[PDB]
Amino acid sequence: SNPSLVIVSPALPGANNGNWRTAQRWKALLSPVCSARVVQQWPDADASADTVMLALHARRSAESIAHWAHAHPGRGLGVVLTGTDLYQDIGSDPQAQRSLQLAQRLVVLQALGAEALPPECRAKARVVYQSTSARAELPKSARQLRAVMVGHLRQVKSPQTLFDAARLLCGREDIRIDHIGDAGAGLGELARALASDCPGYRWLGALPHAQTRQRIQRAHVLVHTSALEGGAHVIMEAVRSGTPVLASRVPGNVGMLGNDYAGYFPHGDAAALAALLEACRAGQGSAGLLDSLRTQCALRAPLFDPRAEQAALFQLLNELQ
Length: 321
Ligand SMILES: CC(=O)N[C@H]1[C@@H](OP(=O)(O)OP(=O)(O)OC[C@H]2O[C@@H](n3ccc(=O)[nH]c3=O)[C@H](O)[C@@H]2O)O[C@H](CO)[C@@H](O)[C@@H]1O
Known about the structure:
This protein is an alpha/beta fold. The chain has 2 domains: 4-131 and 305-320, 3-Layer(aba) Sandwich (Rossmann fold); 145-302, Rossmann fold (3-Layer(aba) Sandwich), CATH 3.40.50.2000. The chain has helices at 18-30, 62-71, 94-102, 159-168, 187-197, 209-218, 233-239, 251-257, 270-283, 289-300, 306-320, and strands at 4-8, 35-39, 52-56, 77-81, 105-108, 125-127, 145-150, 175-180, 201-205, 221-224, 245-248, 264-265. The strands form 2 sheets. Strands 2-1-3-4-5-6 form a 6-stranded parallel sheet, sandwiched between helices. A 6-stranded parallel sheet has the order 9-8-7-10-11-12, sandwiched between helices. Strand 10, helix 7 (233-239) and strand 11 form a beta-alpha-beta unit. Helix 2 runs parallel beside helix 3, helix 4 runs parallel beside helix 5 (187-197) and helix 4 packs across helix 9. The longest helix has 15 residues, at 306-320. Bound molecules: uridine-diphosphate-N-acetylglucosamine. Residues 16-19, 21-22, 56, 82-84, 109, 130, 150-152, 156, 180-182, 206-207, 209, 212, 226, 228-234, 237 line the site of uridine-diphosphate-N-acetylglucosamine (UD1).
């Protein structure tokens, strides 16, 4: 008999964020070989038919992870390290550390993620790069540089780095920056004030996923400053659109873009990001940095094909059964 998979995701049904997107897409991808359902907590009324658990975020789903582990000791449990659990919580949070213990498998969303796990947990760690649909790569104009950052405003995304970079460039009309993401910490008020002082910066608020991918595809560069990432959706969405990236040098980003990528800046170093934006703009009048990055990003694009994520999921599913 086919397994009955239950995905635990802390996102609210229908929400437009990474946690919901992973869960829905994993459900669609595993449905050829198993019955799949997504819940916010476990157990529930239908819990006794479940045979495999895939739980997102070792701390936020901790109580559901522990209920499963106590209900099925030694069998069927995979814990997915979404970012903040892995680069924050497992250093000191007791529940985060418990879920690492109890899991049969540990899923990290890029290659560098197991490095951040304790050594006794690496043997059961598994990499599942995420996937996304492609968009055709558009030729873009050389007359100005348009940059986009996408992420609901949370401190973990370090929007202050984009804020400060925008200011360093307050006086350049040939460089434009659009910021997509809900207000989400008072960072909204900081974006409105920036937008008023520097007309080259625009905070678009939250945008539905289709329009967001369109703007990623239309922009010259995606910018991503996060202090930590499990493996950000927005970066593969750019890569699979032919839109290169500039990103903070953090393991979550470096696992996605490559160890040798030429588009990193030290995290929170706003000046280093402004200079990358300047070098990208300078290269349009002349191969410049933009095309180097694009060449490097085209080499990363196959990592985010849906057939490859499903194959990784299939094998993980066998191992939990
Ligand atoms: C740890 C961290 O810092 N982020 C993690 C978080 O995703 P998190 O939600 O933080 O950020 P992601 O980039 O991964 O996902 C955001 C998704 O929402 C969409 N979007 C966002 C704002 C908006 O206004 N309009 C819109 O459509 C983006 O295109 C993207 O598809 O959990 C994911 C796994 O579930 C991980 O892959 C992320 O690395």
